[PDB]
Write a structure and sequence with these properties.
Family: Belongs to the CbxX/CfxQ family.
Number of helices: 15
CATH topology: Serine Threonine Protein Phosphatase 5, Tetratricopeptide repeat
CATH architecture: Alpha Horseshoe
Shape: elongated
Largest sheet: 2 strands, antiparallel
Subunit structure: Part of the ESX-1 / type VII secretion system (T7SS), which is composed of cytosolic and membrane components.
Protein name: ESX-1 secretion system protein EccA1
CATH superfamily: Tetratricopeptide repeat domain
GO molecular function, one term: ATP binding
Keywords: ATP-binding, Cytoplasm, Nucleotide-binding
Radius of gyration: 21 Å
Bound molecules: samarium (III) ion
Helix content: 55-70%
Structural class: mainly alpha
């Protein structure tokens, strides 16, 4: 009624304000969600303004049946907001544009995986058909399983990646396959897959995991000068405390597991529970 008109006009203003001031747009999108917690489009607006609080992504997901309703009442396509969400998990820095509820699903699953809410992540992934986007769900499962160190389940999800349309995501999948191999002490396989994935369109987005796991594979095989060369490259290009630490200490090694060990977990989601 009166409130509908008010929220419409706040949304329209928020979108117009985006090139001028994300801070002011945020105030307006937040004013909408304060009055209507179900206003999916305004939760997405908040994400666009740099609000990636886990609750904001949860709310966008929870209100997903309202996607398009508020923006639609002022004739704005949600694609015009140019909101993006994180979907790379541990493998790389990969974002995806929020142009449909699929994006929200993927973002929510990645965020839940990061928080350790794996069943909730999986349940969101399986809540609806994916309608020509099977590879995207497989990718997100690889993210969720990887977060829980379920390396054999990662491989199950990405082993088919040669047949994916999206060559970027097929490349990312090769990184996941290589990381999973390394964590299972399949170091030669890890080196082949990570080297190939490095040539793909995902090589840059996944540069950190690619170099780290190559270095760890080389070190565990005994090839210390290769490991050091990769870690020196990392400290130059993507410096990090654990890279500095690994470069200074040759006993710094990847702790690996096996299919049998993963299967013996009292709780498959908990790498600490190996019986
Ligand atoms: Sm999170």
């Amino acid at each position: 009624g009166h409130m509908t008109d008010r929220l419409a006009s706040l949304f329209e203003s928020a979108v117009s304000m985006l090139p001028m001031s994300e801070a002011r747009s945020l105030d307006l999108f937040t004013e909408i969600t304060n009055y209507d917690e179900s206003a999916c489009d305004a939760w997405i607006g908040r994400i666009r303004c740099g609000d990636t609080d886990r609750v904001t992504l949860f709310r966008a997901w929870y209100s997903r049946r309202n996607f398009g309703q508020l923006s639609g009442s002022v004739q704005i396509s949600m694609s015009t907001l140019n909101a993006r969400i994180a979907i790379g998990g541990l493998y790389g820095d990969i974002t995806y544009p929020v142009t449909s509820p699929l994006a929200i699903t993927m973002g929510f699953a990645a965020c839940e995986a990061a928080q350790g809410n794996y069943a909730d992540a999986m349940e969101a992934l399986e809540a609806a058909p994916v309608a020509g986007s099977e590879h995207l769900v497989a990718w997100m499962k690889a993210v969720v399983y990887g977060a829980a160190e379920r390396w054999t389940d990662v491989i199950d999800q990405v082993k088919s990646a040669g047949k994916w349309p999206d060559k970027f995501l097929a490349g990312a999948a090769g990184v996941a396959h290589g990381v999973a191999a390394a964590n299972l002490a399949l170091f030669t396989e890890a080196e082949r897959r990570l080297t190939e994935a490095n040539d793909s369109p995902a090589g840059e987005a996944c540069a950190r995991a690619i170099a780290w796991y190559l270095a760890m594979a080389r070190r565990s095989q005994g090839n210390e000068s290769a490991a050091v060369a990769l870690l020196e490259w990392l400290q130059t290009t993507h410096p990090e405390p654990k890279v500095a630490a690994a470069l200074k200490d040759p006993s710094y090694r990847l702790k690996t597991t096996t299919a049998e060990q993963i299967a013996s977990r009292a709780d498959p989601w908990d790498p600490g529970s190996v019986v």
